[PDB]
Curated annotation (Swiss-Prot):
Its cofactor is Cu(2+). Glycans are attached at residue 138. Lytic polysaccharide monooxygenase (LPMO) that depolymerizes crystalline and amorphous polysaccharides via the oxidation of scissile alpha- or beta-(1-4)-glycosidic bonds, yielding C1 and C4 oxidation product. Catalysis by LPMOs requires the reduction of the active-site copper from Cu(II) to Cu(I) by a reducing agent and H(2)O(2) or O(2) as a cosubstrate. Is able to cleave cellulose and xylan to produce C1- and C4-oxidized products. One of its GO terms (cellular component) is extracellular region. Cu(2+) binds at residues 1, 86, 175. The modification Methylhistidine is found at residue 1. It comes from Thermoascus aurantiacus. This is AA9 family lytic polysaccharide monooxygenase A. Pfam families: AA9.
Length: 228
């Protein structure tokens, strides 16, 4: 359980969608982060992978604001403290807005994977995962926006999948957090995109999995990494 509380770009903080404060207001502020209804700080499980909730979390609506990123620039997402028990991959996707991200129909977004990290070491099962790397970085993740993609407005969909209950059907816990970016630079690629509702299925080999046994490999879920 947790959420993204802050985003660092170009030497400043963009405040996140503080899901334990803003939902409790009739007049919340404008941010780059999407609003959600996930006030339990929880997850979308396999029962929701083909509902709109998987796209940018439960009841999500676009952020009003969009943050500019320098060409090949970094986006640092700062989480609430991630529990060590919640072992799993950290995955990052972009989808183009083809206009202002604030007015997009989330159900039409087509995501391409720009980064993935999974099982890092398995010397002592359940081992050390991308989520443990995030904890070791003081609950921060660094995303480099590719230089080879077409610039424009994009949704960044940044996600932890916790696997501590993933040996039973619909036990994996997805934690997607979306923010609006203005990608800048000289790139041209328009990568093949996947609908949010086709990213994951509740029987995928990296989703329905017992992490407590020795693993020889881990197949990171979702469509193939874009490498440009
Ligand atoms: C994170 O930073 C704090 C100090 O602000 C430090 O005490 C702590 O050990 C750091 N955590 C890790 C895992 O490096
Ligand atoms: O999430 C869990 C308890 O915190 C296990 O399913
Ligand atoms: Cl609730
Ligand atoms: Cl922690
Ligand atoms: Cu949790």
């Amino acid at each position: 359980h947790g959420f993204v509380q802050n985003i660092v770009i170009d030497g400043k903080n963009y405040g996140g969608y503080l899901v334990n404060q803003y939902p409790y207001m009739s007049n919340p502020p404008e941010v780059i982060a999407w609003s959600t209804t996930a006030t339990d700080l929880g997850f979308v499980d396999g029962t929701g992978y083909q509902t709109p909730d998987i796209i940018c979390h439960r009841g999500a609506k676009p952020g009003a604001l969009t943050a500019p990123v320098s060409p090949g620039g970094t986006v640092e997402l700062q989480w609430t403290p991630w529990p060590d028990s919640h072992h799993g991959p950290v995955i990052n996707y972009l989808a183009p807005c083809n206009g202002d991200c604030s007015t997009v129909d989330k159900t039409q977004l087509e995501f391409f994977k720009i980064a993935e990290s999974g099982l890092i070491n398995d010397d002592n099962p359940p081992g050390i995962w991308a989520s443990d790397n995030l904890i070791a970085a003081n609950n921060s993740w660094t995303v480099t926006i590719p230089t080879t993609i077409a610039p424009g407005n994009y949704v960044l969909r940044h996600e932890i999948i916790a696997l501590h209950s993933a040996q039973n059907q619909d036990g994996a816990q997805n934690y997607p957090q979306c923010i609006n970016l203005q990608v800048t630079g000289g790139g041209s690629d328009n990568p093949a995109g996947t609908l949010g509702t086709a990213l994951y299925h509740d029987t995928d080999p990296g989703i329905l999995i017992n992490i407590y046994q020795k693993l020889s490999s881990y197949i990171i879920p979702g469509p193939p990494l874009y490498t440009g």
